[PDB]
Ligand binder design. Structure first.
Ligand SMILES: [Mg+2]
Ligand SMILES: [Mg+2]
Ligand SMILES: [Mg+2]
Ligand SMILES: [Mg+2]
Ligand SMILES: [Mg+2]
Ligand SMILES: [Mg+2]
Ligand SMILES: [Mg+2]
Ligand SMILES: [Mg+2]
Ligand SMILES: [Mg+2]
Ligand SMILES: [Mg+2]
Ligand SMILES: [Mg+2]
Ligand SMILES: [Mg+2]
Ligand SMILES: [Mg+2]
Ligand SMILES: [Mg+2]
Ligand SMILES: [Mg+2]
Lengths: 389, 389, 389, 389, 389
């Protein structure tokens, strides 16, 4: 049968600050989705956080961009906001609900969406990812690696079924333009775009052999929605695995280097992306509690839950960063975080001026006496003597 | 509404030695505060230890320095002492109850107090800290960093709402004098005082833009109360976060370097301040069990519990050192503790002579034959020959 | 009394991918073996996974190569397949069931078998091992060490009862030939064979003093069964300990170096063998849940469960890699995995061409224009100019 | 007496590539400056490289911005170019000679200039720095620290002579505007500017107590001169030490964190600034040979030569990174370089798009078919099917 | 002008064993090449070792495959053999002189050859590499990376002049066939071949834009020449840098991971390729002394000498692994060598059976009693009892 897998995610309040979610928010969301399942709106679901972001993973047969699914998520977020976040006066209550009026699609309103629709395969393993304290382009390097780097994905070389490569759908979020680039041949041009992680984001990946959907990344940029910094984007990502798609382990290998990503404190820094364990996973209650954000509101973290689909039912989730091999990766991230923080507010630890334009900093800087440089050279001695006296 | 948040802390016995508390002490204290809540004396509470010190976190509407609140804490400590510590003959039963007669304020009696009163904000995140095996000045470096170091608190630079700085209320605990110093302009003078951690302690911090209370640190010095060493002070600290105050993560960043602090064994050493996880946190029972003190009666440790206030109710606590990023910090502390302990009883691992004057050491040293140096030079050969024979 | 200990193992589906098993598969298998025990088919059992492989450990009095025991395992695997794996559409449902027709012995059908029959000693400690993401020859180095390396097994030198050495039964899986070699005298020749881990596999070890069975390793090679790569072999191993056999700790010492083994991603790589803890061990339910495979579908892992036999009953299992001493070994493995993965698809991280012949790679390589080298030298300039234009 | 200290630096060819200089270039430059000294054009000099950049350190009494001094440097660089670099066909022969016509000041022509004029103190210690593979803003963090960070410069707190702070002259190299900001009071605003290292560069620092010159950094931006990437800027910096200025060790402390800086390969990356030893220092010949650039054309490195001035004579240089304490710092840099390089061409390892506009990359990216995003959503299936077929 | 650069290398005796060369061998070779230069046979030269292999780097205008050049090298090696190696009875005197009769080309006789002919560019930086204790395929991973891995060579992405890619000439040394593959499009197929490092060796690389020669690797396989193991091949490699070819630093970056390579002890192991400093470099005498081979006859090492060509003259060499950044890489190699050596003679530390066929091992193994496996199963008890008695 054909199934749609949708992740719709939002921050509707933190506990405390931006560190985490309140567990009653997850319980409320799970109860609401259980009711939707009973009414036949969805087939199955799983609710989980990473940091202060709540992901609603839903399987259904309504297709992508469906108003009922998108609306169910919106309503769930609004009810969590009103019933839980406002009640406990959580920080950033309703943070990502950036627009008032739901008119059918949740894109552009603040919540993140990643979805794919496909014929369910004879085995259908999928991985759901969620990151906090970063942007959607944080997934650019992992997505490139798992679909186009033969040092990551051995299948590109050694599995005859994969050797034709992949099609990357890249969104320019500034000019609202889409690029379609094919690996291996277009790898260099692809990289020239997606290395600019804040602008050119991999949104979807398709297999070249047949066009099958392979991955879907959420591309909402909160600062472009709001016109100012109101949070990190905090993306979600779906990847289908195996059988001419990257193995589960090839997908995970793509996260084994905890690369520097943009976000962290105040949406204004760069730090390592730590692949983190969940605190708890409860398959029967359909809830997982992900990691906290601590020093400097991070470091940024990503969680990975694996599932097997059957008739759209979700067996899972399985925490796929739960291995002593990944402890080494977490330790690296911890040490890199310490190293880079000693830079304080200097680029490249602090972000470039184009992202700083969304913060209050240009404000502040607009008290302050420039002097024209040519004239200043003549006057330097008198200006210095004025400061001295 | 206006709310007061009070932490009143005391060691009333250890289990064993000074290593930890007995869990029935926390259960007794929680039960007593539940009764106070039922009678309307307080709104909410949380009870927890770090090492051998019990913190009573209470929210109420009675204001700072209130005899009913202070008295409720005193009575709770006295009852724990009598009912639990004496019964099990715990070590240092009633340790910090240094005076007999409660006359309305618990300051000067041995228990530590940190309190602030404010209009509860639309979201009110707060962090409660407790340290064991150290002095109140152990919080001087973190407090300076989170309110005045742009390498810690990015908001000083990049958040226009924070750029006016902070007012530090510094207590000279020896001469009983208060200094008010404003950052950024007074940073150097501030540091000249607060670097002398045993004498000049940050007691309160206020936002300069509006005067809002930002932090309150407990400044009781047990040795000055008793006139002799009877324990480490073991401070408690309240910090309000976000919205023109340091972010939760900026506050936590201030503890990411496990700096050397005074205390540890016998109140007479210096060692790293380890940011430690709680052993357990039970929000429903309102109890958290903090870490033990082990090698050399430490190393010194600090715990961090975050809360969100609503109508004075405390949602929380959340262990804010619970992140693999902080494992790196704990490992550093562990290694520094090993390194410094190889010094044995030599300064600067052993504390200066002004703190040693509170111990029994001057006693001992007063057997022992000084010779006037000028005369000794003439006589050296005969003295050495006398020792030899 | 005489007892037989049999481990019969198979992968009948993964959760997700090849990462792990679904816990209902273990519960189903345990329930089936409980029924067999009630009917007197077996004495006792234990069910556990490492990665995506399910081991059925069974004690009974039917001897080695018994059709009833082998059939009970086959049937259990077929029922797990049909009832659980197919139902949840697990990945590789029925993966290791390579032949259709059970005719009395499970060898050659895909499941791995290790068995020994002996008079149960006055104390009968045994260790069951299971590895995932590797081949049976992964156990060649540990088996050599525990029975023939005096740097591992001190008993060879210092215990007079062990000094006569051991008999290794080595199977050449390609030519179907058996070698019998005796240590210490034949050590060099033994090593010349078993260093070729994919071809010459230690199948059984016997004590030289009396012929007692000491160890049994499972030698099924899935690629030779199927004629193509269909998975890693994923061996199981039984070792009897103590009393003129290696001590439990000597057996474990043999795994303290996490040596490179063949398998890992796509059966086509080499990586360190990590000695891993079980996630959980439940002696009363007779189930242990072993580790997951994550980065790059590994690294390869081995688990160790110890038991004491009494009248064939299995007291245990005990996780024998559960010690901080082995954390060092896991950390080493984690770091070696990171190091070697930076090689990508180059030998020796990628496996030799004789194992690659079982994959799809020769396929792919057969598009592609060889030129005879002597002729190419004359024509090189024209060929390069053709590519350029 | 009054003396001027001038560093005039240029890359006029590398050996090989951009790795180093040819030693005959230094010998030629030293011989030319010896002749100038004999003719009374300058008092003293020292010639040295870091990487592929040659610094001419000259002491004289001609003042800042002097046509004779600037001309002597220009001529020396032109002669090295013609006589040595062209002869040996070195890479980038004459690299930094960006304009043809010397009209009196070398600024704007490609060579870097840092100069200060002052009354020579009763002791006049100075430090000359040179960095390769980076920009002038690489010195922003060290300069801030040594003059404004009390965690670096203890003198700000504990030396009464320093407590009034410093005046930073900050150049906006894009709009040609100068800011004058005073620490401690203007620290936050200062940081808001100088954290944007490619735009707002500390050019000069003065003591607030008296206006004395403290430091001078070279601010030429080759890309703004040429209109395209032609190299990294590769700055030089002079700092006067002691006696109410930072101690030699406070200046050096400012380089003890090997912070990330912009430049490295192709002027397009970020990497750690390694404080490197000179290969050799020959005070009598007036030549020092600095470090090579190797992996990835770096990592970026800084060298530090100390001198004592007497009547303008230069006693020195002394390699001030030559201490086992700095080996730790180099090791950190080496490890950070390895870590960050695994990112490849992704921000923040790759530089932002505003610096990439100076490279050939926008060129390349301008082949490549954007689709308008709204329309693409309708057409996605047909486009993917077109790629597939 | 057009110039040819030739490296002709041979081991003609070790000092002691295979550890190093005797310095008089280098002095003799340099003196012989100085005479050739005086007679106009060559333009310039440089003589150096890595381990026990002597590289003769020669520039000339005689073209590739020239009998005079090849003959000059042969004669030099024969004279070093006769005059020095035989005299001091060095180990392996004349080791690589495998054939008796020089008939015009040194290929197939044992010495390694890498050559390229080109128009000398306006700047012509080149790097000469030499490795000991390994095979020519050891350079496969570095060559792939520097010409085809965008994580190594940023120029593939960010330098418009490089974006068209490269042509790899791959030699199948077993079947004597040449493959021509173009990156980026043929990367996966390329890797499928060159990952089999002992069979498919990159021999030459050309720029796709114009056909310019980029690199030449020496592909002689001593075991295929001799029909048995007589040494490791010990390759040499020439790479031209810059100006639409990889930068010097991109070439070096390709060696920054010390990947496992085949060779080491007895041509029969795998170990990390350490990028090593030269012991000494003397540009005036035209001699460099490279590193020794020590533990286990290694680990394998590579040295890198950079040059700038002018009218065919060689300015250089410059040791390009001489940087503290590369100390980290050497330390990694040292630790990996220790780790892997604990495996002893087991694959994958020991090499596969196809390389072992060239050693004496099959000899030895051919004493030793196979039993047919089916029959052995019936007889196992009697065979074991026979061994026991
Ligand atoms: Mg939030
Ligand atoms: Mg978030
Ligand atoms: Mg967010
Ligand atoms: Mg106590
Ligand atoms: Mg205490
Ligand atoms: Mg105390
Ligand atoms: Mg499987
Ligand atoms: Mg398996
Ligand atoms: Mg398997
Ligand atoms: Mg240059
Ligand atoms: Mg330079
Ligand atoms: Mg430059
Ligand atoms: Mg040799
Ligand atoms: Mg050799
Ligand atoms: Mg050789």
């Amino acid at each position: 049968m054909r199934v749609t897998v949708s992740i719709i995610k939002a921050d509707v309040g933190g506990f405390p600050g931006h560190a985490h979610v309140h567990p009653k928010m997850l319980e409320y969301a799970a109860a609401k989705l259980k009711e939707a399942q009973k009414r036949g709106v969805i087939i199955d679901y799983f609710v989980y956080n990473v940091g202060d972001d709540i992901s609603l993973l839903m399987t259904h047969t309504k297709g992508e961009d469906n108003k009922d699914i998108h609306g169910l998520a919106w309503e769930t977020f609004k009810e969590v906001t009103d019933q839980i976040a406002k009640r406990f006066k959580l920080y950033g209550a309703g943070q990502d609900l950036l627009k008032d009026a739901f008119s059918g699609n949740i894109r552009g309103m603040g919540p993140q969406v990643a979805e794919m629709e496909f014929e369910e395969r004879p085995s259908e393993p999928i991985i759901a990812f969620a990151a906090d304290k970063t942007e959607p382009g944080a997934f650019n390097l992992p997505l490139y690696k798992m679909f186009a780097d033969p040092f990551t994905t051995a299948g590109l070389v050694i599995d005859p079924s994969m050797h034709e490569g992949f099609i990357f759908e890249v969104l320019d979020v500034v000019e609202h333009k889409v690029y379609l680039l094919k690996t291996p041949e277009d790898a260099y041009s692809l990289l020239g775009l997606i290395g600019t992680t804040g602008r050119y984001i991999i949104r979807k990946v398709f297999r070249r052999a047949d066009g099958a959907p392979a991955a879907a990344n959420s591309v909402e940029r909160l600062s472009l929605i709001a016109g100012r910094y109101v949070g990190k984007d905090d993306p979600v990502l779906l990847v289908r695995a195996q059988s001419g798609l990257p193995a589960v382990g090839e997908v995970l290998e793509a996260f084994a280097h905890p690369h520097l990503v943009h976000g962290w404190m105040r949406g204004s820094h760069a730090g390592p992306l730590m692949p983190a364990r969940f605190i708890s996973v409860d398959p029967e209650r359909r809830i997982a509690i992900g990691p906290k954000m601590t020093r400097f509101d991070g470091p940024p973290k990503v969680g990975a839950l694996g599932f097997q689909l059957h008739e759209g039912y979700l067996e899972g989730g399985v925490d796929l960063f739960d291995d002593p091999a990944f402890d080494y990766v977490r330790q690296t991230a911890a040490q890199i975080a310490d190293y880079i923080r000693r830079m304080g507010p200097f680029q490249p630890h602090r972000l470039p001026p184009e992202e700083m334009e969304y913060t209050a900093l240009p404000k502040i800087l607009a008290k302050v006496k420039p002097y024209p440089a040519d004239q200043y050279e003549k006057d330097r001695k008198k200006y210095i003597e004025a400061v001295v006296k």
